[PDB]
Structures are given as structure tokens and as C-alpha cells.
Design a protein around this ligand. Structure first.
Ligand SMILES: Cc1nc(Cn2cnc3c(N)nc(N)nc32)cs1
Length: 167
């Protein structure tokens, strides 16, 4: 048993809900929230900007120290940092940004990072302003993640399209 509520069950291990990731995290206080990060951990918009804003910029302060010590992440890679007031941990995962010209094949590699955690609250990686097809991202998630993942889709119209098109 876990604290997640109001989810559509997609498969054995993947669940989905129409929710803003910030509101959904503050309610559950999951062990792990996934951030849709970039390699520089510059949390400007999308999921990253919203989560960071909810931490009063503490996520960005922690992230800048991480980058100063370690350098940038890889596209497809991740790091575990604090979840601040949103979760125990934040898993910062870099999916390919189609609007940066990055290879979409790296989306599977990005989702593989989720398998290092038994349960996660997460957005759809590489969707929204990262420019990939959300239907595709959901399919890659289902076909890659084996641990228990609770997906949040904020756009209602997108949520409706994802449910009705899911095989
Ligand atoms: C770069 C990416 N953007 C998304 C979509 N997206 C944007 N803002 C939110 C938000 N507040 N909550 C949720 N669940 N998804 C969001 C997914 S990856």
C-alpha cells in the first residue's frame, strides 16, 4: 500500500492521473518525485521551473552546487538530489529535448533511470516544451519502466487523448 489516490491503472506497474505535478507532490509527499531536467539542471520552465518555484529556489541552489562539482549530466542520464518540501528525493532525469535536436532514441535510456527506484511520482518525460510526442513517451514508459510509476499529466485535453489512445 502507498499514498497515491485517484489513478487510472494502465498496466501492472504504471498508473496515470490528470494532475499538476506540484500539487500532486505536496499532497502525497512521495519518496521520489521525478524532475524533467536538462543537463545543466537549469530549472527554467515546464516541470523543472514549477517544482523549483515550489521549493522557493532551494532546488536551484542545490543544483548549482551539484553542477559546479560534477559538471553536466548526460542526455538520458539522471542524478538523485533532495526533494526539499515536495518529496524525500528528487530524481532529476534528462530526456531528449526534440527542440534542441537531441536523439529521441535516448528517451528509453532516460526512463531506465526510473528502475533504480521502487515507487515514483513522475511527469511524462520529453513531452510539453521538450517537443516529443506524449503518446510516444507514455508507450516508452510502459515498455521500459518495471518499478511502480505514478504519472501525472497536467493538460486535461492531453490527458484525455492519452487515455483514449492507449493500447
Ligand atoms: C518538459 C515537460 N513538461 C511536461 C508537462 N508539464 C508541464 N508542467 C507540468 C506540471 N506542472 N505538471 C505536470 N504533471 N506536467 C507538466 C512533461 S515533461
Amino acid at each position: 500500500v502507498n499514498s497515491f489516490s485517484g489513478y487510472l491503472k494502465l498496466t501492472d506497474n504504471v498508473y496515470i492521473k490528470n494532475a499538476d505535478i506540484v500539487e500532486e507532490a505536496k499532497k502525497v509527499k512521495p519518496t521520489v518525485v521525478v524532475n524533467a531536467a536538462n543537463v545543466y539542471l537549469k530549472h527554467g520552465g515546464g516541470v523543472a521551473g514549477a517544482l523549483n518555484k515550489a521549493t522557493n529556489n532551494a532546488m536551484q541552489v542545490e543544483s548549482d552546487d551539484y553542477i559546479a562539482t560534477n559538471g553536466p549530466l548526460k542526455v538520458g542520464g539522471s542524478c538523485v538530489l533532495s526533494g526539499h518540501n515536495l518529496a524525500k528525493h528528487c530524481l532529476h532525469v534528462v530526456g531528449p529535448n526534440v527542440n534542441k535536436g537531441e536523439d529521441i532514441q535516448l528517451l528509453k535510456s532516460a526512463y531506465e533511470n526510473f528502475n533504480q527506484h521502487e515507487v515514483l511520482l513522475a511527469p511524462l518525460l520529453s513531452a510539453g516544451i521538450f517537443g516529443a510526442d506524449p503518446i510516444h513517451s507514455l508507450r516508452v514508459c510502459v515498455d521500459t519502466v518495471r518499478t511502480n510509476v505514478y504519472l501525472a499529466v497536467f493538460d486535461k485535453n492531453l490527458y484525455d487523448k492519452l487515455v483514449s489512445s492507449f493500447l
